[PDB]
């Protein structure tokens with residue numbers, strides 16, 4: 001051990017440390033500076049950036065031996081605090097740079113390091129800096145972060161007053177549609193929002209820290225578990241196995257389709273009989289610290305009989321394949337799509353037909369914050385779980401029978417969280433921590449490291465797809481055929497539903513009167529499927545939007561014009577036979593056309609012998625809602641102090657549940673003149689907030705936004721005074737009148753898609769968009785650079801433009817990853833950010849352009865649709881279409897790795 005006297009955030013610190021200790025651990029654990037965020041722990045993400053003697057370093061890979069006596073360290077806490085914000089922090093808030101906020105302290109500290117060395121950076125200087133220092137963001141697409149740095153720099157340089165970094169209430173007084181900052185932004189930019197790992201450090205000494213004993217093979221029969229050595233190791237309390245589980249030890253898929261061949265009870269909480277995928281949790285070590293738990297978990301011996309594993313859908317789907325879940329076929333679900341007339345005769349007589357085989361793979365969510373959760377037994381005797389769940393009510397019912405609790409004896413709460421992008425539509429750690437809390441009676445905390453986040457949370461499910469179009473010479477689509485095989489890994493939750501998305505979205509965007517198709521779901525031993533932003537559309541629409549360009553090519557038609565010819569117009573129906581609710585695609589295409597033409601001209605002019613530029617188009621469509629008559633509930637409450645609390649379970653991945661609540665309520669409450677700062681939101685809690693439903697399917701703004709709107713309208717009525725005006729809280733209480741008022745809303749016009757035909761009206765609101773990608777391909781290496789992305793977006797009406805711009809930029813960036821670099825195919829190689837192709841700032845162009853072409857929705861609150869998943873529906877199709885434009889190469893199977901492109905170029 002050594003004494004080091006240094007200065008941290010301007011304060012002399014008398015430090016006692018191990019010279020080998022990591023600075024991240026010292027700062028977080030010994031000094032309580034939890035504003036230093038730790039994600040990857042491998043120097044790849046920049047979340048733990050601190051300034052050490054004028055240099056920006058990653059604390060997670062900086063040992064204390066590298067910190068000299070007299071050193072100066074600055075963390076986010078030293079940059080600024082609430083009510084004492086640094087210009088960088090103010091700028092972050094104003095520009096909406098904090099979505100989940102997990103990367104915000106690291107970017108801001110890093111940016112201070114930049115500005116301290118280069119006071120007047122160009123935008124490229126800022127990008128170069130964040131690339132060098134590995135500052136990674138999965139939410140924002142980087143552009144808002146650069147905007148914030150530039151604005152802060154201008155203030156620090158005296159070019160504009162610092163007061164310009166403070167939001168100014170718009171001239172029309174409308175918060176709805178504005179850039180009003182989100183309520184949680186100040187906490188995020190000051191490092192004072194506690195995420196699950198932060199909370200773990202601030203839990204009492206009585207807390208047990210868990211480590212998972214995980215399968216190191218993909219498929220096995222389990223014969224036994226020996227915990228003897230582990231029990232003798234430092235700090236170990238106990239080891240938990242399936243024997244300690246008080247319920248069914250199975251998670252239920254809950255809404256398993258009737259024609260699913262499996263009962264939906266296939267997923268264990270702690271594996272008992274079998275390993276179904278690499279990483280499966282077989283036991284939990286409980287110890288005094290994460291480090292001690294992990295060390296002991298390594299010593300738990302599992303006796304396995306390894307079985308042949310099926311590591312892809314086609315492998316598991318073979319007729320003679322062995323059943324992974326004995327008694328259920330590996331292909332456990334099929335969904336037909338049967339619209340209009342038989343397609344065979346139509347293809348036979350059509351002027352033109354095209355077909356393609358496409359593949360979209362096992363995209364990893366890669367939030368900067370790895371999964372984390374904790375649980376404890378309350379004094380009320382209930383089991384409380386706090387996690388990254390984005391569907392707290394959903395998860396309560398998925399896990400209660402398995403852990404052995406009645407629904408009222410378990411409470412799920414959503415912690416502030418550093419992104420999920422859908423992986424948290426699935427239970428991950430909730431049942432594990434519940435079982436451990438129940439078994440020990442003690443608080444328990446479980447933090448995954450980044451390899452566990454990659455290997456042992458769910459993934460986008462790969463689809464193998466074949467799609468065909470028949471059309472007239474003039475480009476009019478006549479018919480479509482489709483086939484898709486969904487590799488869902490071993491756990492069935494929502495796999496059938498995902499497969500149905502193929503019937504809804506393959507070919508979406510166009511009038512196609514005749515469709516015959518079939519989707520199939522297959523269990524495999526690769527990672528289980530969890531929702532990933534777009535949930536079936538990125539697969540479906542990659543196939544159909546690439547196929548549209550192939551059809552255009554075969555017709556000798558421009559691919560934007562082919563889309564214009566076919567795009568939804570009044571009288572048309574979508575693939576499930578439903579009339580679209582608005583018709584904005586022709587408008588969007590017309591507005592994009594001259595930009596597309598100019599982009600083509602630029603690509604021709606600026607191409608060189610080795611660097612070929614191209615421009616690609618695609619359409620995206622997705623529903624806002626869960627299928628059928630989805631519904632939500634909110635409570636609007638007038639508090640004693642005149643503030644209003646809007647109670648919902650709108651789960652915040654980081655997308656902006658807070659501002660969605662405040663902005664929607666503010667608009668609804670305008671007749672009573674309620675200032676936005678007087679409107680409070682509630683964090684999701686199954687015991688104390690209404691069942692607003694999960695934040696999946698880009699549904700909350702529509703469903704919960706409507707519920708909030710209704711609740712507020714109902715509160716206005718409750719407050720209305722005879723003769724005009726409004727009662728105060730005191731007046732209402734004196735009259736014994738209610739002050740907490742419920743609102744409900746249902747998408748009553750929706751119907752579930754039919755099990756035989758796939759036809760129905762599954763969503764009452766959809767999101768519509770048109771993408772344009774501009775790329776350069778180095779034809780010597782096959783490397784593609786995306787130089788620009790444009791999204792024409794119809795969101796109906798914006799609740800908040802900082803929120804929606806950010807959603808779109810974030811989605812476009814994930815599209816670039818999906819197109820060019822991302823996968824989770826190799827269990828070890830893809831278990832790091834860099835290994836799996838995470839897009840760092842230089843991979844995302846500074847030119848991310850949005851054009852809102854909003855057509856108010858009949859059923860949306862104030863006309864709004866959702867936004868969340870729109871920008872990931874098909875940006876990767878536009879990108880691949882752009883590579884084709886540039887070079888003549890079509891990549892059918894994502895991602896377009898450089899060697900893959902190069903092989904195609906040279907074929």
Ligand code: PCD
Nearest residue numbers: 420421422533653656660697699700701799800866867868
């Ligand atoms: N018009 C409009 C719309 C919308 N908005 C906004 O925006 C946001 C979103 O919304 P939406 O669309 O409704 O959604 P939500 O439901 O809330 O959420 C969810 C989503 O969200 C997204 N985004 C995001 N972001 C972030 N940052 N992070 C994350 O993680 C995430 N995730 C993702 C996903 S995946 Mo799934 O679960 O797969 O189905 S689905 C999803 C919010 O804040 C709101 O309010 C506005 O403003 N306006």
Ligand code: FES
Nearest residue numbers: 039043045046060
């Ligand atoms: S770089 Fe330190 S936590 Fe990722």
Ligand code: FES
Nearest residue numbers: 100103137138139
């Ligand atoms: S705001 Fe950057 S990772 Fe979420």
Ligand SMILES: [Ca+2]
Nearest residue numbers: 205235288289
């Ligand atoms: Ca201890």
Ligand SMILES: [Cl-]
Nearest residue numbers: 001002018019
């Ligand atoms: Cl030492």
Ligand SMILES: [Cl-]
Nearest residue numbers: 123147150151
């Ligand atoms: Cl700028």
Ligand SMILES: [Cl-]
Nearest residue numbers: 170178179180
């Ligand atoms: Cl504004």
Ligand SMILES: [Cl-]
Nearest residue numbers: 257258259755
């Ligand atoms: Cl069914």
Ligand SMILES: [Cl-]
Nearest residue numbers: 342343344516
């Ligand atoms: Cl047919």
Ligand SMILES: [Cl-]
Nearest residue numbers: 472473474475
């Ligand atoms: Cl014709």
Ligand SMILES: [Cl-]
Nearest residue numbers: 890891892893
């Ligand atoms: Cl290919």
Ligand SMILES: [Cl-]
Nearest residue numbers: 897898899900
């Ligand atoms: Cl490569």
Ligand SMILES: [Li+]
Nearest residue numbers: 649692693694
């Ligand atoms: Li919810």
Ligand SMILES: [Mg+2]
Nearest residue numbers: 084085086087
């Ligand atoms: Mg100041």
Ligand SMILES: [Mg+2]
Nearest residue numbers: 511569571572
């Ligand atoms: Mg027609």
Ligand SMILES: [Mg+2]
Nearest residue numbers: 589590591593
């Ligand atoms: Mg025109």
